[PDB]
Design a protein around this motif. Structure first.
Motif, mmCIF file in Angstrom:
data_model
loop_
_atom_site.group_PDB
_atom_site.id
_atom_site.type_symbol
_atom_site.label_atom_id
_atom_site.label_comp_id
_atom_site.label_asym_id
_atom_site.label_seq_id
_atom_site.Cartn_x
_atom_site.Cartn_y
_atom_site.Cartn_z
ATOM 1 N N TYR A 41 50.238 -1.335 36.533
ATOM 2 C CA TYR A 41 50.992 -0.876 35.389
ATOM 3 C C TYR A 41 50.119 -0.674 34.188
ATOM 4 C CZ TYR A 41 54.418 -2.836 38.384
ATOM 5 O OH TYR A 41 55.201 -3.109 39.459
ATOM 6 N N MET A 42 48.867 -1.092 34.255
ATOM 7 C CA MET A 42 48.020 -1.077 33.082
ATOM 8 C C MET A 42 47.084 0.100 33.043
ATOM 9 S SD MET A 42 48.840 -3.773 31.383
ATOM 10 C CE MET A 42 47.687 -3.199 30.142
ATOM 11 N N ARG A 43 46.984 0.850 34.129
ATOM 12 C CA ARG A 43 46.081 1.979 34.178
ATOM 13 C C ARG A 43 46.573 3.063 33.254
ATOM 14 N NH1 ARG A 43 45.597 3.202 40.390
ATOM 15 N NH2 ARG A 43 47.788 2.533 40.599
ATOM 16 N N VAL A 44 45.652 3.779 32.685
ATOM 17 C CA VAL A 44 45.988 4.886 31.814
ATOM 18 C C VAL A 44 45.904 6.169 32.628
ATOM 19 C CG1 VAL A 44 43.622 4.854 30.962
ATOM 20 C CG2 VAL A 44 45.325 6.050 29.709
ATOM 21 N N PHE A 45 46.898 7.030 32.478
ATOM 22 C CA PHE A 45 46.988 8.235 33.274
ATOM 23 C C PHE A 45 47.203 9.389 32.325
ATOM 24 C CE2 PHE A 45 48.542 5.674 36.930
ATOM 25 C CZ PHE A 45 47.476 5.943 37.697
ATOM 26 N N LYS A 46 46.392 10.439 32.428
ATOM 27 C CA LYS A 46 46.455 11.591 31.536
ATOM 28 C C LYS A 46 46.932 12.842 32.246
ATOM 29 C CE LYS A 46 43.179 10.336 28.227
ATOM 30 N NZ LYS A 46 43.293 9.100 29.041
ATOM 31 N N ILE A 47 47.067 13.904 31.468
ATOM 32 C CA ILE A 47 47.721 15.133 31.893
ATOM 33 C C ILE A 47 46.667 16.125 32.335
ATOM 34 C CG2 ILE A 47 49.104 17.029 31.139
ATOM 35 C CD1 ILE A 47 50.104 14.916 28.992
ATOM 36 N N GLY A 48 46.684 16.482 33.602
ATOM 37 C CA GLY A 48 45.589 17.202 34.207
ATOM 38 C C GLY A 48 44.648 16.313 34.985
ATOM 39 N N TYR B 198 54.655 -14.001 36.427
ATOM 40 C CA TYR B 198 54.474 -12.673 37.004
ATOM 41 C C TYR B 198 55.773 -11.902 37.143
ATOM 42 C CZ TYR B 198 49.654 -13.574 37.986
ATOM 43 O OH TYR B 198 48.312 -13.784 37.835
ATOM 44 N N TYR B 199 56.819 -12.382 36.532
ATOM 45 C CA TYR B 199 58.088 -11.728 36.392
ATOM 46 C C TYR B 199 58.440 -11.601 34.949
ATOM 47 C CZ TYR B 199 62.723 -10.324 37.761
ATOM 48 O OH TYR B 199 63.860 -9.628 37.967
ATOM 49 N N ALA B 200 57.808 -12.373 34.107
ATOM 50 C CA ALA B 200 57.719 -11.962 32.732
ATOM 51 C C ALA B 200 56.464 -11.166 32.490
ATOM 52 C CB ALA B 200 57.743 -13.173 31.806
ATOM 53 N N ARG B 201 55.428 -11.413 33.268
ATOM 54 C CA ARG B 201 54.136 -10.827 32.973
ATOM 55 C C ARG B 201 54.143 -9.330 33.209
ATOM 56 N NH1 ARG B 201 51.669 -13.827 29.796
ATOM 57 N NH2 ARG B 201 52.896 -15.332 30.978
ATOM 58 N N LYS B 202 54.888 -8.878 34.205
ATOM 59 C CA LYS B 202 55.047 -7.452 34.398
ATOM 60 C C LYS B 202 55.902 -6.887 33.310
ATOM 61 C CE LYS B 202 58.164 -7.018 37.196
ATOM 62 N NZ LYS B 202 59.182 -7.007 38.276
ATOM 63 N N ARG B 203 56.928 -7.611 32.929
ATOM 64 C CA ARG B 203 57.937 -7.027 32.082
ATOM 65 C C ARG B 203 57.617 -7.140 30.609
ATOM 66 N NH1 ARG B 203 63.556 -8.156 33.474
ATOM 67 N NH2 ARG B 203 63.023 -10.370 33.096
ATOM 68 N N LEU B 204 56.866 -8.135 30.178
ATOM 69 C CA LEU B 204 56.361 -8.109 28.813
ATOM 70 C C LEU B 204 55.362 -6.996 28.632
ATOM 71 C CD1 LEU B 204 56.236 -11.773 28.543
ATOM 72 C CD2 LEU B 204 57.193 -10.300 26.922
ATOM 73 N N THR B 205 54.209 -7.120 29.270
ATOM 74 C CA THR B 205 53.017 -6.321 29.000
ATOM 75 C C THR B 205 53.145 -4.858 29.413
ATOM 76 O OG1 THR B 205 51.846 -6.637 31.074
ATOM 77 C CG2 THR B 205 51.953 -8.431 29.581
ATOM 78 N N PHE B 206 54.257 -4.478 30.020
ATOM 79 C CA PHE B 206 54.558 -3.089 30.300
ATOM 80 C C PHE B 206 54.647 -2.323 29.000
ATOM 81 C CE2 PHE B 206 58.244 -0.298 30.129
ATOM 82 C CZ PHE B 206 57.780 0.730 30.881
ATOM 83 N N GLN B 207 53.739 -1.399 28.800
ATOM 84 C CA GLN B 207 53.914 -0.371 27.791
ATOM 85 C C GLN B 207 54.380 0.879 28.506
ATOM 86 O OE1 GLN B 207 51.358 -0.782 29.767
ATOM 87 N NE2 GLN B 207 49.492 -0.097 28.741
ATOM 88 N N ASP B 208 54.962 1.790 27.758
ATOM 89 C CA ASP B 208 55.413 3.000 28.392
ATOM 90 C C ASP B 208 54.187 3.822 28.698
ATOM 91 O OD1 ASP B 208 57.794 1.862 27.608
ATOM 92 O OD2 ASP B 208 58.185 3.292 26.036
ATOM 93 N N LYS B 209 54.117 4.366 29.896
ATOM 94 C CA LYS B 209 52.907 5.070 30.292
ATOM 95 C C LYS B 209 52.796 6.437 29.694
ATOM 96 C CE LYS B 209 53.110 1.959 33.639
ATOM 97 N NZ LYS B 209 54.363 1.234 34.005
ATOM 98 N N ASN B 210 53.608 6.805 28.712
ATOM 99 C CA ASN B 210 53.235 7.952 27.929
ATOM 100 C C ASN B 210 52.662 7.581 26.588
ATOM 101 O OD1 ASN B 210 55.703 7.279 26.741
ATOM 102 N ND2 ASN B 210 56.737 8.945 27.759
ATOM 103 N N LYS B 211 52.881 6.371 26.093
ATOM 104 C CA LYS B 211 52.140 5.936 24.918
ATOM 105 C C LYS B 211 50.923 5.152 25.381
ATOM 106 C CE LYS B 211 55.144 2.168 23.978
ATOM 107 N NZ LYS B 211 53.984 1.229 24.163
ATOM 108 N N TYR B 212 50.027 5.921 25.995
ATOM 109 C CA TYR B 212 49.070 5.544 27.030
ATOM 110 C C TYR B 212 48.387 4.210 26.847
ATOM 111 C CZ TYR B 212 49.262 10.550 27.534
ATOM 112 O OH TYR B 212 49.675 11.832 27.700
ATOM 113 N N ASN B 213 47.645 4.062 25.761
ATOM 114 C CA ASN B 213 46.788 2.907 25.593
ATOM 115 C C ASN B 213 47.041 2.158 24.306
ATOM 116 O OD1 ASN B 213 44.934 1.592 27.242
ATOM 117 N ND2 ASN B 213 43.184 2.321 26.067
ATOM 118 N N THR B 214 48.110 2.432 23.601
ATOM 119 C CA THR B 214 48.389 1.623 22.436
ATOM 120 C C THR B 214 48.946 0.312 22.940
ATOM 121 O OG1 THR B 214 50.659 2.195 22.174
ATOM 122 C CG2 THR B 214 49.051 3.668 21.264
#
Lengths: 158, 104, 217, 290, 121, 75
Positions: A29-36, D23-39
């Motif tokens: 869940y931590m990997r960064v994925f980009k467009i293209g 590991y059932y909070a750990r997935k669900r806390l640290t989940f950022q949305d994968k379109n706000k990539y690395n903030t």
RNA sequence: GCCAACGACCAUACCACGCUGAAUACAUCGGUUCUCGUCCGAUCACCGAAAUUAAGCAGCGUCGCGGGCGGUUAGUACUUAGAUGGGGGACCGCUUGGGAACACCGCGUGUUGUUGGCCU
RNA sequence: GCUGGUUCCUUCCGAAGUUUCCCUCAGGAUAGCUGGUGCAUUUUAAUAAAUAAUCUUAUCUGGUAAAGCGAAUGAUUAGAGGCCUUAGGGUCGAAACGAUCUUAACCUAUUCUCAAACUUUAAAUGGGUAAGAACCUUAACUUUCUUGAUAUGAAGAUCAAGGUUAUGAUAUAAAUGUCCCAGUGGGCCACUUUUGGUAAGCAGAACUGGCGCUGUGGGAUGAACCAAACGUAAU
RNA sequence: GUGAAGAAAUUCAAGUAAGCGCGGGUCAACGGCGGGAGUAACUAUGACUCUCUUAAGGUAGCCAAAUGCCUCGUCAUCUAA
RNA sequence: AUCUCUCAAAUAAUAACGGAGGUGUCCCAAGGCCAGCUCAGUGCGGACAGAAACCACACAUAGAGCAAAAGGGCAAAUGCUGACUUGAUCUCGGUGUUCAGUACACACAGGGACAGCAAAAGCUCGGCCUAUCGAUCCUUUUGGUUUAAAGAGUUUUUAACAAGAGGUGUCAGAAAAGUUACCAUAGGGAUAACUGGCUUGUGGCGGCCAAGCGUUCAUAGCGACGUCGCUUUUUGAUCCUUCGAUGUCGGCUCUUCCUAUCAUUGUGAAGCAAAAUUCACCAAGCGUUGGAUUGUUCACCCAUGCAAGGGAACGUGAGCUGGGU
């Protein structure tokens, strides 16, 4: 007299490995994925939320739309025979990162740099790959224990 | 048996919030003419034809789905939402009671 | 009903396994696989002789019944009643399906034209490869003539073609006969039913120690 | 028994074997949305011990969590909190501490003064406009039951009164009786000022001297009478807002390989010489009788 | 089970636990009726021991014929300082070869205090 | 009757006759079915691209209003 | 050489047993007035320290289990490709190339990140 | 929706017996295959620093061949060892509770053989993608935003730097519309794989190549075999 | 045809003939016309007995029938067969 | 129509009235979510306490459970129990599957809105994932504070538009009982009965090895369990040939051919004294009958006979007959 439907013959596509069951490790869940970006698809059998279908597991393709927790990949699917460009949404643990660009992207650096050190010496570039040539003409001494060393059969009696 | 609790708080489309909604069953409303489809099937049939239209045989389903009109309790708006096919269904219920011995 | 095996001589399918709901299948009496002094230790029977095959033959189980009762009834005649160990090395774990015309009583009137095509089970078979021994006779070295001649009369009940190894094994061990003794002579091999023990070293100490105890004291 | 047990058994992870994460909070806390990539996430850890609580702000990463800032209750004897380090009120000032130990890293000290007069109301911060939006954090309690008024929420109450924007409700703050709520803010002003620890002493000043030989001893070793506990805890709040010095240390050092110390691990040579004598000792135990 | 007609969710049995400041008085009440030279097993291998009693009135209570008599089973679990490590939510863990209680740890401690012999039949 | 229902002979000789027809390599591709804003944001940055030469230098002078940016290296 | 919090990959980490563990610690541990939960202050919850390093835990020991790795079984088994090659058949051989697997023998017993901290 | 016929000659290209639907199974529609007719044009278009399809490279995937049961599941032969107290006969004994062996299990370390609906391991033949200017960095700009104190990230719009264009060998031209125009939608044969059947010149599938449509050379003979594909002639 | 509600179209209600439904009669009307068990001083057989069903259990009679599968039934006769 | 494992030959696809099964439902919780706890089983203990329950401590990698088939999957869950619930809601398009790359249907990734649980992060658009379903037309209901009835106004009514429902299971969806030996047409060798072909479960069949029997004696003569081959007139199996026609049972008559030898000629062997017989070899030269019953073929019966073989063009209908069908 069939297959049909949607997850048939996935007793080994979406089987888990030997003893890799359990909680998905949390880097996925931590990997960064980009467009293209380019990406592979191994449908993870422990996550039912939007597995790829069985005709896309094994296949790589380019991301072109990323969302909250899934990614919309473009996978080439051969039909008869006109290869189509599909547009597949999958989640993240059904995706890995490709490595097929990763070697090339280190070849683009070095061909920029093997010309960069040759920017000062001038000559000469020799940038492009070669497939394996013939070796050369050597000569090799025994030098080290002259010949024979001589294998000769005796292969049946048994 | 499929209980439905006869009240629920779902989306009242007129009030634009979730309101408390009384639940019912849709039953049928018979075919009262002059609907134009009857006003036609009452002239194609008329004298000397010998039954013009299909008489549907070959009934295959054993159940039907159920539709609940769900009247709003503030603005009395209604809403028809179906369910799945169920062969037994009583709303109102006598809600399930769990961990229980059959008595006497 | 007791189907001939002129019609069942090859490995024609990938082999039928034995299910766990099909009870009503025929109960055989191929239940015996070892014959002779099966209880004697390794020191009692050091000679071992196999009946090695030469095709990818599929053997019937009728032939394997005959191949044991033939070699018993020379070795209880010309070897002494206990001086051997006949052993079938080869189990008949397959199914043959026989669609025979049990089409008497003459008025069912649909019986099969080609409707349907289920098979019908009437026995076993045992599949063999090249260089795969079928029987092995573990005995003493004195009856070497009596055993290699006992197995000729086991050839002529099997289809195919067989070749008769006398082993460099020390009976039913995995070891070579001379190499058996060298590993035996101090502590390193232990007796069993009809076999040995293989380097009891690791670990950790007491198995090295107590097996060194009794060979010392 | 239990030998081919081991060929097939595989292990729950590491920190489910130690019993530390879930590991059932750990997935669900640290989940950022994968379109706000690395903030990152910037959650808020609160972990508590027998001696000393701990609050760290962190955000996870692929290679282990990064940590921006941390603040312990063991720093508090600087600021006047000598004993009683796992109060709720001692848990308050630690979460107050990182909420000023971290805004110096961002320079968010002109803005978001926070609830300067602490009384026990849910004063979530306001985004001061035309510039820096408030720092964001989310609570990570992990493996403690979030019961109504546990010690971990004063640490949260330290942060939101420090100035960090955390979404929270009040239902696990102390004294907000869920039968029925009872937004009674003032019981914080008795708890965040620690006074019910003092009123436990004031209800035990009169019964047993051995009660002071029991619990809340060593307030008696420092003369800490049951009257001035607010005056400690008031003074800390204006003194924690003086200087979080971030615990600079310049020993530099006495650390390297002292003294050996922990029984280095016997390479195969001296393993073999241990086995060589042991096999020689056993025949020597056998050659004794013969 | 229908051998005695007990049913799923029939509530056949009652049980209650006692921790601290009431175990050590109830047990000695239960030991005088036991006349505490109690038989040898009665002793589970994990250092635990329990026993049956009859005639429950003699535990310092009135007979009370409105309720009648009731046969009881006792079970006492012993421990050491430290067993909460087995039973916590956070950083749990097992104990070891010792502090685990052997049966001898449960027989000595019954021989030492309460002075009862174990009746090694 | 039953001679030949459902075969694949001649099926990849046909599919390799007017041959196997890779799709395309399009410079731009349809954004049809992308995240719908995302795309309204990029439709707002596409309009506001106004400086080619003029303002694009100027805001560095505005960075010097805080003598640069020493502080904001953190968040 | 360590410790705690938070981790990453998730057994070289696991399991069994035995020994050791300065300091920092962690615990174990004392209580029920408050918050709080329980049939039961055991569990949680909250208060704070007298006791202890027993145990957890940490480090290690064991021709330990397992798991990791390497050689080796092996150019073997199988396999692309070719013949108007053998054989009555099963099947085999050759040519052209790719090439394993159990077992077996050895060798290793977690590596590390961010932040505070101890220094025997 | 079936049978029979369907009238000149040369020149060019040249099939299908498959898919989905149909009161459909001797037929249609439908896509695939086909011809026609163009058109657009390339430093792979007309006096390449760029495409495209077998190998190489790099990297993904797989659970068949082989291997395995001293790994799980599932069958499963043979004995060995065992305090045993599950112990069946007993036995010395009133029983033995003293003890003796025996026999059954049970436990321990083995062992024989396997499995279309069993797996730890795991090939060859394969399937996917990549292999540079549509590139590589550098910059500050843009955004209403949802996320962010560089009002940082992202995705973009214009500048700055870039050597010799980034495996091999190929190009009988490729790219693209329309007429989705004709016919076809009964296939048979064969290597290796394979299911039903006892077998079959039988039945049904996977791959490649053929026959159908194809003459000539060879196998005396032949739809498919082995050579070889065919303008009229000489050598 | 009748009443009622309505601005009307119309909707409602009572009532509701023959058939059908219920009921009786008829088989020189169409047709139909049973089982299992136990038993008699040798076996056998079952006059009898139990019992289950049904609208009624095939009566007088005839029969391997131009009608009986098994069947070329078993017995006698006709025959050298 | 549909689902699961296998077939399936390591992508995906793949067939047969192939193999083993499933579906037309079930659930106001079996849906959601937050918290707490861990299961199959085994082991030692405890009055009435065996298999008896129930309390109780240790072991316990899922060997449990998850509505149901099968397969995957799950251990601080997706399991168990408790809290609180209605996201099993409303809206707009897009994607995966089936694929023609069409529709339903199921699923998925989102935007908008309204909400539930939760301290929050978050999670939820039914059922942990792969089945659990249905056009047009018509009927119907709910919705606008709707548009139209075309000379104009208001009210009834009818209609329209949007979302559901009523169902086609032959499941891309006509409304549908038999018979014809009285028959008919279009065709079909795409399709049976009939010869020929290929095939052998059946038919028929002769060597290898001997457990044996043979008084004794294995093989004079037989020969158990094996094992290997041989023939195709029956029995089938197929559907190659023929349906703009190959006269379809037999018998009568008459030919020739084959041996798998019944008898005769020539010999060998015997548990061969003679007689009688049995075994075997070379052998098709000459024979292989008269009748009762039955349409039959084999059939059995009387009689002849030192001694009464078996078969080939399913031989033979412009050869007859016409008994059988």
């Amino acid at each position: 007299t069939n297959s049909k439907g949607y997850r048939r013959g996935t007793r080994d596509m979406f089987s888990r490995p030997f003893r890799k069951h359990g909680v998905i490790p949390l880097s996925t869940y931590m990997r960064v994925f980009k467009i293209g970006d380019i990406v592979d698809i191994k449908g993870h059998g422990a996550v039912q939320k939007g597995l790829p279908y069985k005709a896309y597991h094994g296949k790589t393709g380019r991301i072109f739309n990323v969302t909250q927790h899934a990614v919309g990949v473009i996978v080439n699917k051969r039909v008869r025979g006109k290869i189509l460009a599909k547009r597949v949404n999958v989640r993240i643990e059904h995706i890995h990162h490709s490595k097929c660009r990763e070697d090339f992207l280190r070849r683009v650096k070095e061909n920029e740099r093997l010309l960069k050190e040759a920017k000062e010496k001038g000559q000469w570039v020799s940038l492009k790959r070669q497939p394996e040539q013939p070796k050369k003409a050597h000569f090799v001494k025994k030098l080290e224990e002259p010949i024979a060393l001589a294998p000769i059969p005796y292969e049946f009696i048994a | 048996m499929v209980n439905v609790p006869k009240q629920r708080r779902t989306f009242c489309k007129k009030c634009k919030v979730h309101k408390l909604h009384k639940v019912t069953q849709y039953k049928k409303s018979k075919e009262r003419k002059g609907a134009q489809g009857r006003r036609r099937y009452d002239r194609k049939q008329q004298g000397f034809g010998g039954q013009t239209k299909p008489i549907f045989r070959k009934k295959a389903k054993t159940t039907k789905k159920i539709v609940l009109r769900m009247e709003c309790t503030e603005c009395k708006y209604r809403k028809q939402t179906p369910l799945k096919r169920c062969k037994h269904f009583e709303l109102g219920g006598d809600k399930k009671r769990k961990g229980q011995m059959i008595q006497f | 009903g007791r189907r001939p095996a002129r019609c069942y001589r090859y490995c024609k399918n990938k082999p039928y396994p034995k299910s766990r709901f099909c009870r009503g299948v025929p109960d055989p009496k191929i239940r015996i696989f070892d014959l002779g002094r099966k209880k004697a230790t390794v020191e009692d029977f050091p000679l071992c002789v196999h009946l090695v095959s030469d095709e990818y033959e599929q053997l019937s189980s009728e032939a394997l019944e005959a191949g044991r009762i033939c070699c018993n009834k020379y070795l209880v005649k010309y070897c002494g009643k206990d001086q051997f160990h006949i052993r079938m090395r080869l189990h008949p774990f397959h199914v043959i399906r026989i669609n025979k015309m049990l089409s008497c009583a003459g008025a069912d009137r649909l019986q099969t034209g080609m409707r349907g095509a289920f098979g019908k089970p009437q026995g076993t078979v045992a599949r063999v490869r090249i260089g795969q021994p079928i029987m092995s006779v573990r005995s003493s070295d004195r009856y070497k003539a009596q055993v290699i001649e006992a197995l000729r009369r086991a050839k002529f009940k099997f289809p195919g073609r067989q070749k008769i190894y006398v082993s460099k094994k020390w009976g039913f061990t995995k070891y070579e006969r001379e190499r058996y003794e060298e590993l035996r002579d101090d502590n390193r091999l232990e007796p069993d039913g009809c076999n040995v023990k293989y380097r009891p070293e690791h670990g950790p100490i007491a198995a090295w120690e107590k097996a060194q105890r009794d060979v010392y004291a | 028994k239990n030998k081919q047990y081991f060929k097939r058994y595989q292990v729950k992870f590491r920190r489910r074997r130690e019993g530390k994460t879930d590991y059932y909070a750990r997935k669900r806390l640290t989940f950022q949305d994968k379109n706000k990539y690395n903030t990152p996430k910037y959650r808020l850890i609160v972990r508590l011990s027998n001696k000393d609580i701990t609050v760290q702000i962190a955000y996870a990463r692929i290679e282990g969590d990064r940590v921006v800032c941390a603040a312990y209750s063991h720093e508090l004897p600087k600021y006047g909190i000598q004993v009683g380090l796992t109060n709720y009120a001692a848990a308050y000032c630690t979460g107050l501490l990182v909420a000023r130990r971290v805004l110096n890293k961002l320079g968010l000290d002109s803005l978001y003064a926070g609830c300067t007069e602490v009384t026990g109301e849910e004063f979530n911060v306001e985004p001061v406009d035309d510039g820096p939006g408030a720092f964001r954090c989310f609570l990570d309690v992990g493996l403690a039951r979030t019961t109504t008024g546990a010690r971990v929420f004063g640490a949260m109450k330290g942060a939101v009164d420090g100035g960090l924007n955390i979404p929270h409700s009040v239902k696990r703050f102390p004294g907000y009786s869920a039968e029925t709520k009872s937004f009674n803010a003032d019981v914080h002003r008795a708890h965040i000022f620690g006074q019910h620890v003092a009123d436990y002493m004031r209800s035990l000043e009169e019964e047993d001297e051995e009660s002071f030989k029991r619990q809340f001893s060593r307030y008696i070793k420092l003369g800490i009478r049951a009257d001035d506990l607010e005056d400690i805890y008031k003074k800390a709040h204006q003194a924690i807002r003086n200087d979080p010095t971030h615990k600079v240390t310049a020993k530099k050092s006495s650390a390297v390989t002292k003294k050996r110390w922990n029984a280095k691990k016997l390479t195969n040579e001296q393993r073999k010489t241990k086995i060589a004598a042991h096999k020689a000792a056993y025949v020597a135990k056998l050659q004794s009788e013969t | 089970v229908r051998s005695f007609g007990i049913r799923r969710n029939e509530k056949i049995a009652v049980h209650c636990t006692v921790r601290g400041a009431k175990a050590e008085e109830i047990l000695e009440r239960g030991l005088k009726v036991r006349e505490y030279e109690l038989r040898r097993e009665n002793f589970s291998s994990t250092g635990n021991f329990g026993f049956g009693i009859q005639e429950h009135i003699d535990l310092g209570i009135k007979y009370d014929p409105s309720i009648g008599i009731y046969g009881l089973d006792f079970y006492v679990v012993l421990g050491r300082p430290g067993y909460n490590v087995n039973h916590r939510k956070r950083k749990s863990g097992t104990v070891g070869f010792q502090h685990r209680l052997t049966k001898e740890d449960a027989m000595k401690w019954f021989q030492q205090k309460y002075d009862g012999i174990i009746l090694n039949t | 009757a039953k001679s030949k229902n459902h075969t694949n002979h001649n099926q990849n000789k046909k599919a390799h006759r007017n041959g196997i027809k890779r799709p395309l390599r399009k410079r731009h591709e349809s954004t049809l079915g992308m995240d719908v804003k995302f795309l309204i944001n990029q439709r707002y940055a596409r309009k506001g691209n106004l400086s080619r030469e003029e303002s694009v230098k100027r805001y560095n002078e505005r960075i010097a209003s805080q003598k640069g940016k020493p502080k904001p290296v953190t968040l």
